[PDB]
Amino acid sequence: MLSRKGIIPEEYVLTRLAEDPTEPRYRTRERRARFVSKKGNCNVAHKNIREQGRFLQDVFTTLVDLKWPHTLLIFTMSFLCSWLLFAMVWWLIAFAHGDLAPGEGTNVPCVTSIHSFSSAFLFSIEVQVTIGFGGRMVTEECPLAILILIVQNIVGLMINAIMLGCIFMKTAQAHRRAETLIFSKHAVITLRHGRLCFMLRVGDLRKSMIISATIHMQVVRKTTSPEGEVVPLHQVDIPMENGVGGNSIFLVAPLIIYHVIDSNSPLYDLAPSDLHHHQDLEIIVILEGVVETTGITTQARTSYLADEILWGQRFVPIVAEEDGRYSVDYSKFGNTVKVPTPLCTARQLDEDRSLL
Amino acid sequence: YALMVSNYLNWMVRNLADMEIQLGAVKRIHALLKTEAESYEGLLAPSLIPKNWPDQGKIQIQNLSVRYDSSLKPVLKHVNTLISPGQKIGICGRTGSGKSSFSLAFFRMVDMFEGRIIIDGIDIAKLPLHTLRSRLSIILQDPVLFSGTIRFNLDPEKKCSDSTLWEALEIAQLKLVVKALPGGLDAIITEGGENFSQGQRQLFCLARAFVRKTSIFIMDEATASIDMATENILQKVVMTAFADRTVVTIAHRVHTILSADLVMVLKRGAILEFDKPETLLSQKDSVFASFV
Amino acid sequence: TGLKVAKRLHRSLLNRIILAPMRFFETTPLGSILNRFSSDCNTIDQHIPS
Amino acid sequence: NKIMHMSTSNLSMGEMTAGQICNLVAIDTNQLMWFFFLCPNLWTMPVQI
Amino acid sequence: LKQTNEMLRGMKLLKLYAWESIFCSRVEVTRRKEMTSLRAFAVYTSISIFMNTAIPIAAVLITFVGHVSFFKESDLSPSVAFASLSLFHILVTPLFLLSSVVRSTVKALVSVQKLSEFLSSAEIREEQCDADNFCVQIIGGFFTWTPDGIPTLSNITIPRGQLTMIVGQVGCGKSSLLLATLGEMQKVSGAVFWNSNLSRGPVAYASQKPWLLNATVEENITFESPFNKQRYKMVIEACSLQPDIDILPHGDQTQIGERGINLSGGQRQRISVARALYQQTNVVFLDDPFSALDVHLSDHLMQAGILELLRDDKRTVVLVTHKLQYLPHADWIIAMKDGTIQREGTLKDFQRSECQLFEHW
Numbered sequence A: 001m002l003s004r005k006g007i008i009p010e011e012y013v014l015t016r017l018a019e020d021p022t023e024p025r026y027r028t029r030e031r032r033a034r035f036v037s038k039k040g041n042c043n044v045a046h047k048n049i050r051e052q053g054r055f056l057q058d059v060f061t062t063l064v065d066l067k068w069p070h071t072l073l074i075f076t077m078s079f080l081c082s083w084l085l086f087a088m089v090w091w092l093i094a095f096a097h098g099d100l101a102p103g104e105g106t107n108v109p110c111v112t113s114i115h116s117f118s119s120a121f122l123f124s125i126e127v128q129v130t131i132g133f134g135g136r137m138v139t140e141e142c143p144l145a146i147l148i149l150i151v152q153n154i155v156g157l158m159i160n161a162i163m164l165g166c167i168f169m170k171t172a173q174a175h176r177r178a179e180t181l182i183f184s185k186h187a188v189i190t191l192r193h194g195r196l197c198f199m200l201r202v203g204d205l206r207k208s209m210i211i212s213a214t215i216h217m218q219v220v221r222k223t224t225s226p227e228g229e230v231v232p233l234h235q236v237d238i239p240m241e242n243g244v245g246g247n248s249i250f251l252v253a254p255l256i257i258y259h260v261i262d263s264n265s266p267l268y269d270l271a272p273s274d275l276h277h278h279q280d281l282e283i284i285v286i287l288e289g290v291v292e293t294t295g296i297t298t299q300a301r302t303s304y305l306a307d308e309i310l311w312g313q314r315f316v317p318i319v320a321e322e323d324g325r326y327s328v329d330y331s332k333f334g335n336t337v338k339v340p341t342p343l344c345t346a347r348q349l350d351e352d353r354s355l356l
Numbered sequence B: 001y002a003l004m005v006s007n008y009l010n011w012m013v014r015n016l017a018d019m020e021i022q023l024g025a026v027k028r029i030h031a032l033l034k035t036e037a038e039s040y041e042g043l044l045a046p047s048l049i050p051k052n053w054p055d056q057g058k059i060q061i062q063n064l065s066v067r068y069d070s071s072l073k074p075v076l077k078h079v080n081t082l083i084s085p086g087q088k089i090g091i092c093g094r095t096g097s098g099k100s101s102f103s104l105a106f107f108r109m110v111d112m113f114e115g116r117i118i119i120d121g122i123d124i125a126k127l128p129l130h131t132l133r134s135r136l137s138i139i140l141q142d143p144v145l146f147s148g149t150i151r152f153n154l155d156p157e158k159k160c161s162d163s164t165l166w167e168a169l170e171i172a173q174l175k176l177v178v179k180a181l182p183g184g185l186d187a188i189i190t191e192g193g194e195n196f197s198q199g200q201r202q203l204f205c206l207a208r209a210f211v212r213k214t215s216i217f218i219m220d221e222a223t224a225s226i227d228m229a230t231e232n233i234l235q236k237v238v239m240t241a242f243a244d245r246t247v248v249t250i251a252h253r254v255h256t257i258l259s260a261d262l263v264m265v266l267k268r269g270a271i272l273e274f275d276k277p278e279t280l281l282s283q284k285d286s287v288f289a290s291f292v
Numbered sequence C: 001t002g003l004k005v006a007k008r009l010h011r012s013l014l015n016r017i018i019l020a021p022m023r024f025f026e027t028t029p030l031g032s033i034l035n036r037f038s039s040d041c042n043t044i045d046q047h048i049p050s
Numbered sequence D: 001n002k003i004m005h006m007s008t009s010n011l012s013m014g015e016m017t018a019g020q021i022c023n024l025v026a027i028d029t030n031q032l033m034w035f036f037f038l039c040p041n042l043w044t045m046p047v048q049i
Numbered sequence E: 001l002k003q004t005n006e007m008l009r010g011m012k013l014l015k016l017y018a019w020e021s022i023f024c025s026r027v028e029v030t031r032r033k034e035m036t037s038l039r040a041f042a043v044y045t046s047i048s049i050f051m052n053t054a055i056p057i058a059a060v061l062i063t064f065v066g067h068v069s070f071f072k073e074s075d076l077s078p079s080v081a082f083a084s085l086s087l088f089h090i091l092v093t094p095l096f097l098l099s100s101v102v103r104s105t106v107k108a109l110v111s112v113q114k115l116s117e118f119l120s121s122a123e124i125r126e127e128q129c130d131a132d133n134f135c136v137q138i139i140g141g142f143f144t145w146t147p148d149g150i151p152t153l154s155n156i157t158i159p160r161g162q163l164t165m166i167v168g169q170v171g172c173g174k175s176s177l178l179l180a181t182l183g184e185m186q187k188v189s190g191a192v193f194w195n196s197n198l199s200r201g202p203v204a205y206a207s208q209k210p211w212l213l214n215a216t217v218e219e220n221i222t223f224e225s226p227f228n229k230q231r232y233k234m235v236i237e238a239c240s241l242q243p244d245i246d247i248l249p250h251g252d253q254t255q256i257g258e259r260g261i262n263l264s265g266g267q268r269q270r271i272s273v274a275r276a277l278y279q280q281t282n283v284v285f286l287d288d289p290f291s292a293l294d295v296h297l298s299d300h301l302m303q304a305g306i307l308e309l310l311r312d313d314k315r316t317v318v319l320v321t322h323k324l325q326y327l328p329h330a331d332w333i334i335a336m337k338d339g340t341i342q343r344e345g346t347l348k349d350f351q352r353s354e355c356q357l358f359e360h361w
């Protein structure tokens, strides 16, 4: 009616090719998916999962692990609805017994001094919360009244028990939902003691240190085996080059997670040519451990891409020895500076030792 | 009115989107109108400074400088040369940095950081671009014919003379074809020039001489210039040159450039030595080596 | 108003192209010129007034 | 699908060129498409009137 | 639009010729002729807008005037009048749009009729209706172009690693024979057998008329094939397309082909035949790569590419070309004259016929 398409012409057109616009936004998006995010939020599509049945315990568990403002709303609604539901049925019993009827001293009501639904709401509040003023109270010979009083008390006890349990476990567990572990955005490959080393920096933002910190580093690559095996995300564990060869690390001041790339190390063939963004060469560093205060084991994974690895760079020294204590300049924590270093391949570096 | 509010609001939004889409068409055309224009006409007195038509074919150069892709202009830098009427000043140099240097700068349709060109004493640069090109016959490289009146393709819009130019052009090339051409004076049905060959358009370029009595030819040979067609082209050109014309030729064909009175071998904006026999091919060790 | 604007606008566009330099034709693709001269012109000619 | 099975004879390529067949897809199919858009309205409009 | 596209295609010639002003006037005159027709569109669409915008008003005017003044059936109560006014709006949408429905139905009938005729047009022949290799055995040889009416081709009679070369004149059953062999011609009688050793399998093709897509240079050459660095470089060197792809503004990514970058007949023929070599199939069919090219040395480059490919793959190659540079050397010649096959005559067997052996050399 009020549209330009009152009659559609549908006439053919002859417009020559003009594809590329001024904006390069059409081809600008070229990001490649990663199975572990920088912030440690791994995201892998678990598509086509067999439908495991759902149980009411999952809903109950979801109540326990809810947030603080949501828990207050759930329990306030639970308390208010419980009082309101029982006030409604209290009103029914009084109505069905003639208590709500106009004044008559002959009969004894099932609940004394119950007149309107407002009194019924107040009576349910007094019974469930156990205030029990006594102006409105239960009487005898009304078996339904005794039965509902038992039901309301039993229901009130179970509701209160759930609230205490939910509150009790909230303070215990929700305190351990904070991740104060920071890695470096970009890792480096430097030349320490003559041997190439892949290094990254990790620090602790909480005064209480992580007890028994274990570090796990894994190279993820679609490594097709020479025999014919093909695996999309094969994980190769990498040693730590620690003082004892173990995975224990002390976290007081941030340190460099340096691993010497040797023949055993899969990074023996690492090159800046294969350092581009579209190369399947990704490092995963995981520092597990238990925080002393609470006792819950904590994990903080991080993923380093080839493009996020800066070849031939050195981490800035951090800890300055002041007169009394040690100064940590966390502003320059993950800042890497260049240094004159060999830029060949660690596999090709074996020739330098052979030549010398 | 409340009932109709619903559909009114929907169609106001829908038509607004349509106008937003269709107002981008005017935006695109305004971008096209924002393009620059070089020069409508020059700054000179049209009374006596110019002449009716340069039928001589003599050009004078005063430190010619050419420019294209202003970031770098390695072509035709401070080159000075003199024009001899009726001769064949061939131009053929490096394929990459010396082939189309002089050709681009000839018709003033390109930039020039410096330079000074005068034709027979009149100021070529100071004269209008259309006025300068009105009396400068040229030749093409690829066969292009404007569909429509084929006579209008050859004869000018003014059409000062029809039969004389028609007969002279026929004698120059394809006398039987031109005389027996069913198009005639009108020749409206060009049909994209399927009947005509590649070299036929070159005669139409030469028709400008019979059209405008222009001595200077801006020639160029490419796109399967056969030996027989070139010989017919050469025969017409030398006949015209003997009477009044002046020949200027630029091509990469070795045979066409070999039979040249002079040479203007250009490489990266530098012109090699010019001598009478093939620019002294026997003595020179550069042009002769590349020739074979 | 729509019809006379389209008639006036087309003439102005063509008169601007004739003044174009040689670098403009050698750099800008012909398809873009044809698009702005055919598709854009058709909309203003027919659909823009409606 | 009929195009794949079509014959490339001169009569089948001159009388009905590639442009004619391509134009049919553009113009004719769109016309049939729009009829199916308006088909329910064709049987309904008399009811409203 | 067709007139102006030809104008702007020859920008350099028109600009240098100083004929842009004269040719601009011709385009302007054509637009002036079209402007009269545009006037009708604009003038008569105003009537459509006016009729749509003024019919409901007129209907309301006559209804209320007639009911109140002339008929005087009853009073004009607000309830009945405005309920009827809303009914006028609701009922005037279909009363106005029913015309477009009828037009759409009429166009649908026309469109379906045209599509029905297209679906019942001529159709190609249905598939599957001691060489010791992929061979072509022809004995009967009774083919034709049109399904009926004056059959022309008759008595056609013609392994792997065989550089067969049919030689003949223009119109003497050369390209038609190859097309008939491909299975795209009409069969009258005979029995053509396709033997598959390495119903027919994939066949490379490069017809006399070059055919190109509108895609990148590599995309046009690949023809939906995986990119091979050595293979892609090898073919372009044989075809000498390196200078031609370099002059392109994008290099090897320009929109080469129809509705893309304009080219020349010789360049189109070279790239068309180049794609056939890249196909790398059990058989390769070619049709006069140098017919539209006057190249003197590119034939030698083609010979080097053909000989290298023939040695490497030994794929059957039928190079039907009229080039007299490699005609009698090591080629399985065969002559079909005046729209009829004559004999599969080898180089030694041709001297027995002694028809036109000396013409080539």
Ligand SMILES: CCCCCCCCCCCCCCCCCC(=O)OC[C@H](COP(=O)(O)OC[C@H](N)C(=O)O)OC(=O)CCCCCCCCCCCCCCCCC
Binding pocket: A054, A055, A056, A057, A150, A151, A154, A155
């Ligand atoms: C003096 C009075 C005092 C009153 C105070 C309170 C009295 C308490 C009495 C004790 C029994 C009450 C049961 C309450 C259960 C609370 C929550 C609970 O434990 O549920 C959990 C279970 C099972 O259910 P589910 O988890 O959803 O199971 C489905 C799924 N497969 C899963 O396993 O996750 O448990 C269930 O939920 C039970 C499953 C039974 C399934 C039957 C479906 C319909 C139930 C209601 C109708 C009963 C049948 C009709 C009876 C007619 C009688 C005339």
Ligand SMILES: CCOc1cc(CC(=O)N[C@@H](CC(C)C)c2ccccc2N2CCCCC2)ccc1C(=O)O
Binding pocket: A001, A003, A005, A006, A007, D037, D038, D041, E093, E097, E098, E100, E101
């Ligand atoms: C892209 C078109 O897709 C559509 C398709 C339809 C279905 C339809 O009958 N359409 C035609 C009707 C015919 C008779 C003109 C039409 C087109 C434009 C504006 C309004 C209308 N009339 C619709 C019926 C009621 C009055 C107005 C609806 C809406 C749309 C839409 O998303 O715009």
Ligand SMILES: Nc1ncnc2c1ncn2[C@@H]1O[C@H](COP(=O)(O)OP(=O)(O)OP(=O)(O)O)[C@@H](O)[C@H]1O
Binding pocket: A182, A183, A184, A185, A186, A205, A330, A331, A332, A333, A334, A335
């Ligand atoms: N002073 C600091 N306090 C807290 N977190 C820090 C601090 N310095 C670095 N980080 C953390 O370390 C990581 C990167 O370390 P780096 O020193 O390179 O910081 P950055 O380059 O400024 O990082 P970003 O761009 O992520 O903010 C990030 O997760 C960042 O939040």
Ligand SMILES: Nc1ncnc2c1ncn2[C@@H]1O[C@H](COP(=O)(O)OP(=O)(O)OP(=O)(O)O)[C@@H](O)[C@H]1O
Binding pocket: D008, D009, D010, D011, E145, E146, E168, E169, E170, E171, E172, E173, E174, E175, E176, E177, E208, E288
């Ligand atoms: N597609 C066709 N449909 C019908 N008749 C055809 C067709 N192609 C060719 N003909 C007819 O058959 C004759 C022989 O055509 P054919 O293709 O065999 O010639 P040719 O010698 O291969 O040609 P060319 O010089 O193009 O390679 C033509 O002269 C024409 O009369």
Ligand SMILES: [K+]
Binding pocket: A129, A130, A131
């Ligand atoms: K209490």
